[PDB]
Amino acid sequence: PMKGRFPIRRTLQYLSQGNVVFKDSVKVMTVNYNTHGELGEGARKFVFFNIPQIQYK
Amino acid sequence: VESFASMLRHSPLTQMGPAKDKLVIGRIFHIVENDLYIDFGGKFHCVCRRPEVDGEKYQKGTRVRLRLLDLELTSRFLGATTDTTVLEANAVLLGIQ
Amino acid sequence: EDFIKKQIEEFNIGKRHLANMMGEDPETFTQEDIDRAIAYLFPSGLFEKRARPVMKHPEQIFPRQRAIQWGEDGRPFHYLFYTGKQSYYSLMHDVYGMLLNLEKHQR
Amino acid sequence: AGSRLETVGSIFSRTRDLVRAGVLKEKPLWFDVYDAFPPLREPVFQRPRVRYGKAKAPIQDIWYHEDRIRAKFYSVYGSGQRAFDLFNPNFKSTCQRFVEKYTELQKLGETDEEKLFVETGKALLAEGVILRR
Amino acid sequence: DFNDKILNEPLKHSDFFNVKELFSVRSLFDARVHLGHKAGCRHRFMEPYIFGSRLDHDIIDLEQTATHLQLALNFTAHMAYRKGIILFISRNRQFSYLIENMARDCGEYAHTRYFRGGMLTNARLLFGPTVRLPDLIIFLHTLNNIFEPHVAVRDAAKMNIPTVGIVDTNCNPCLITYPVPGNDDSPLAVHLYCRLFQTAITRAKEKRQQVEALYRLQ
Amino acid sequence: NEDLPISMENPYKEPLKKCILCGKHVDYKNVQLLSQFVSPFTGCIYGRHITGLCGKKQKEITKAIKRAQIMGFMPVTYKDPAYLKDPKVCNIRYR
Amino acid sequence: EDFDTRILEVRNVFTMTAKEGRKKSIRVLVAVGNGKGAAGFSIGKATDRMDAFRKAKNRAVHHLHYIERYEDHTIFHDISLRFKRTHIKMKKQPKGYGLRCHRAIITICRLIGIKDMYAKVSGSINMLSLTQGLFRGLSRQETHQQLADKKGLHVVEIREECGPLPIVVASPRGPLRKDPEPEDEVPDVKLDWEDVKTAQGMKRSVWSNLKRAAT
Ligand SMILES: [Zn+2]
Ligand SMILES: [Zn+2]
């Protein structure tokens, strides 16, 4: 089997189903997310699951 | 109607407590020519040797008083996932009635 | 099973024929007479009696075998049938019962 | 025929689905009665797995506030003179009467455990029961 | 078809033979069925049937005990009314005499002596080609002297025969259909189970007799 | 409901038994005690199963014995004859 | 007579003895089945080939497992398992497909009565353990009535021949559940790199899609 904890992240259709496409203007995006931020759980799960979709798109 | 919890709380064993270092009266149900088995209480009977004094005074229905160590002899050894049992109980007698 | 009665009646008829041919009344007759007649009419140099010719009664010839131990349908008759050694175990049960009864009383 | 493999599942499942397949000529005797009066737990084979770590058991021991006083009485005045009779149900005993007195005194007067214990001792001495351990 | 109707009639009714009046938690507690071996003798699959523990001794849940006992008695009585063969097992030699005697009294049969290899599996070769193996097995002591699962539960689960065993804290209730938690070892418990089974099977037999007489009348 | 059990400690618990010296103090100068804790003839130190005390106290007294031996308070081979008529704590069977 | 037999393998086992030395002992594996979801595997050992066949066939017809099937021609859902270093992965497949599986599995399915599926075997190839794991999985698979009555929801089937139409498969026999399942997103499920490859299409191999014989 695949080794990642959520191999659907590494799958290709997961990257393609991403529903976001940035404008040609934005060149760089920076993220700052704490590890144990109980409010930052959303940020951490985003950085874990979604950024691959963004970078692929 | 009375709950089994109530019957156990008022049971003779819950008030008995630890079986060790406690006297109890009992009687025998089977007896071989050399030894006698007392049914005293709880689950198991206790096997005992016939004493040298008053040898013949041991028949069915005799009420003998005696102490006991535990109501079940068990022990767990190095390779015993379940502790070995004896199906009996150790006891020492010093009187009758 | 009917072969047993067949052999019995045929053996009785053969015994009557034997008495007739030897020449005595069939009213009184014995198995020592049977064996003497067989030894005389059919001698044999065979040494073992089991091999020598013998006209014996079928009850003693055939070894008794247990009849059907259960009825035509359903349960068996004896109460140890579902184990072997039923007769032995029933006898031992009766023996132990007698032992404990005598106990409570007291080649 | 009948299926001899029992680790698969329950006898009922096997008999039922074999009758459905049409292998057996007709059901056995116990089938209908089992279907009518099923048990609380379906009989299925499962292998026993020893425990490891902190998975000791859902079971816990049995103790009581009055068991505390039973312990304290067995410790202070132990080996009661009377011989316990386990045949008789609801058999009254020295320790049982003593725990009854303790409880009634403590939930009537609402005093300190040690002094109500001492006065329970005084009360049973007035009653005249022997106090030798 | 009316024969099948008579066979099926007792099923729809609950407690149709009045098996409930025989047993009560009073009688069980008096016979000391509620006892259990030490925690060292405890078993996982028996854990949930343990109401609790005291002095490292196991205690049985009497509500579950009564439920399983009711179910077992009802099943045995239905089978007896169907004239289904019943076979007892108690490898414990302490009560073989009493158990064989009550088996004789019932008319249902028993096997307390040593169990032979494949007695049920190869029964055809052992006894004969056509033989009616029993329709119900029950166990007064599920374990043997060495405390392994008696081969009979395995053989019955294999050859599709129902089993009803009194399971102690050491026993394996997984294979049992109607496991009855109780005290396999105590003489009061043994005698009480024997008397209950006597009453149940005899009631079922006499009830079949009376129903057959009523139908012969009609 | 009220008759039901309750989570609670076991007051039947026997208190943890303590060795004869679990609480007491030991020094390299109590030659009496340190000679009670050694064989009389060969001078060999009796082990734990002979002595019957906890490991911490066994270690303390054996180190103190070695210290006294090297210091001069005690000999190595023969137990002192004056300390023989004292209580025998260490169990034996040869007599 | 409803049962049909099949000999999966035969081998000439040899074990030595003091005075006679090497002894030939035929071992055989067999299966039996109706074609109605009931079947059974078995082994047979004997000095003679025909006698071993007979022993195996008899104790096979006596030892049998039953397995359900969805619409008389498929399993209910794909089954992936391992058994003695024998990984096996069967995939459900709709009609008009056939049986593209290990020939042993093909014969076993001929006996069972299912007409089409797919399967793959990985790791060791010991067809005894193969059959054992096969029957284990086909017995441990859950039916749709079972799953519906367990969960408390309505099963809904969707085809490609049929458009966006909900086809109910089975409903709970007991009281239906009130609330629906919350949408499980990005689930923690261990998937297979080979099937992900074959789905992404980048995978290439001459040996995959062959135009073999009938079924
Ligand atoms: Zn027991
Ligand atoms: Zn200490």
UniProtKB/Swiss-Prot annotation, chain B:
Q: Which UniProt keywords apply?
A: Acetylation, Disease variant, Mitochondrion, Phosphoprotein, Primary mitochondrial disease, Ribonucleoprotein, Ribosomal protein, Transit peptide
Locate the transmembrane regions by residue number. none
Q: Could you state one GO biological process linked to this protein?
A: mitochondrial translation
The primary location reported for this protein is mitochondrion
Q: Where in the cell is it found?
A: Mitochondrion
**Which residues are modified to N6-acetyllysine?**
57
A single GO CC term, please? mitochondrial small ribosomal subunit
One GO molecular function term of this record is: RNA binding
Q: Which family does it belong to?
A: Belongs to the bacterial ribosomal protein bS1 family.
What quaternary structure, including any partners, is listed in this protein's UniProt entry? Component of the mitochondrial small ribosomal subunit (mt-SSU). Mature mammalian 55S mitochondrial ribosomes consist of a small (28S) and a large (39S) subunit. The 28S small subunit contains a 12S ribosomal RNA (12S mt-rRNA) and 30 different proteins. The 39S large subunit contains a 16S rRNA (16S mt-rRNA), a copy of mitochondrial valine transfer RNA (mt-tRNA(Val)), which plays an integral structural role, and 52 different proteins.
Name the disease.
Answer: Combined oxidative phosphorylation deficiency 47: An autosomal recessive, multisystemic, mitochondrial disorder characterized by intrauterine growth retardation, swallowing difficulties with failure to thrive, hypoglycemia, dehydration, and hepatomegaly. Additional features include global developmental delay with impaired intellectual development and absent speech, microcephaly, facial dysmorphism, cataract, sensorineural deafness, skeletal features, and cryptorchidism.
Name the gene for this chain.
MRPS28
Positions spanned in the full protein: 77 to 173 of 187
From Swiss-Prot, chain C:
For this chain, one GO molecular function annotation is: RNA binding
Q: What GO biological process terms does the UniProt entry carry, in alphabetical order?
A: mitochondrial translation
Q: Does the keyword Nucleotide-binding apply?
A: no
Location relative to the cell: Mitochondrion
Supply one GO CC term from the record. Answer: nucleolus
Q: Which domain of life is it from?
A: Eukaryota
Which keywords does this chain's UniProt record carry? Acetylation, Mitochondrion, Ribonucleoprotein, Ribosomal protein, Transit peptide
Q: Quick check: keyword Mitochondrion in the entry?
A: yes
What's this protein's family per the entry? Belongs to the universal ribosomal protein uS9 family.
Subunit relationships:
Component of the mitochondrial small ribosomal subunit (mt-SSU). Mature mammalian 55S mitochondrial ribosomes consist of a small (28S) and a large (39S) subunit. The 28S small subunit contains a 12S ribosomal RNA (12S mt-rRNA) and 30 different proteins. The 39S large subunit contains a 16S rRNA (16S mt-rRNA), a copy of mitochondrial valine transfer RNA (mt-tRNA(Val)), which plays an integral structural role, and 52 different proteins.
Name-wise, this protein is: Small ribosomal subunit protein uS9m
Query: From which organism does this entry originate?
Result: Homo sapiens (Human)
Its gene?
A: MRPS9
Swiss-Prot record, chain F:
Write out the entry's keywords from A to Z: Mitochondrion, Ribonucleoprotein, Ribosomal protein, Transit peptide
What is the scientific name of the source organism? Answer: Homo sapiens (Human)
Q: Please specify the portion of the entire protein covered by the chain, as first and last position out of its full length.
A: 47 to 141 of 142
Does the keyword Transit peptide feature in the UniProt annotation? Answer: yes
GO process annotations (BP):
mitochondrial translation; translation
What gene codes for this chain?
A: MRPS18C
According to its record, what are the GO cellular component terms? mitochondrial inner membrane; mitochondrial small ribosomal subunit; mitochondrion
Q: Record keywords: Transit peptide included?
A: yes
The protein depicted here goes by the name Small ribosomal subunit protein bS18m
Look up the domain of life of the source.
Eukaryota
In its miscellaneous comment, the UniProt entry states:
There are 3 mitochondrial isoforms of bS18 in mammalia, localizing to 3 distinct sites in the mitoribosome. bS18m (bs18c, this protein) binds to the same site as bacterial bS18, mS40 (bS18b) binds to a novel location of the 28S small subunit, and mL66 (bS18a) binds to the 39S large subunit.
Where can this protein be found?
Mitochondrion
From Swiss-Prot, chain G:
Output a single Gene Ontology CC term carried by this record.
mitochondrial inner membrane
- Which parts form a coiled-coil structure per UniProt? none
- Per UniProt, residues of the S5 DRBM domain are 3-67
A single GO BP annotation from the record? Answer: mitochondrial translation
The reply on keyword Ribosomal protein is yes
Molecular function, one GO term = RNA binding
Where, subcellularly, is it found? Mitochondrion
Sorted UniProt keywords:
Mitochondrion, Ribonucleoprotein, Ribosomal protein
Q: Which family does it belong to?
A: Belongs to the universal ribosomal protein uS5 family.
The UniProt subunit note reads as follows: Component of the mitochondrial small ribosomal subunit (mt-SSU). Mature mammalian 55S mitochondrial ribosomes consist of a small (28S) and a large (39S) subunit. The 28S small subunit contains a 12S ribosomal RNA (12S mt-rRNA) and 30 different proteins. The 39S large subunit contains a 16S rRNA (16S mt-rRNA), a copy of mitochondrial valine transfer RNA (mt-tRNA(Val)), which plays an integral structural role, and 52 different proteins.
- What's the name of the protein? Small ribosomal subunit protein uS5m
Q: Which organism is it from?
A: Homo sapiens (Human)
Source taxonomy: Eukaryota, Metazoa, Chordata, Craniata, Vertebrata
Protein encoded by which gene: MRPS5
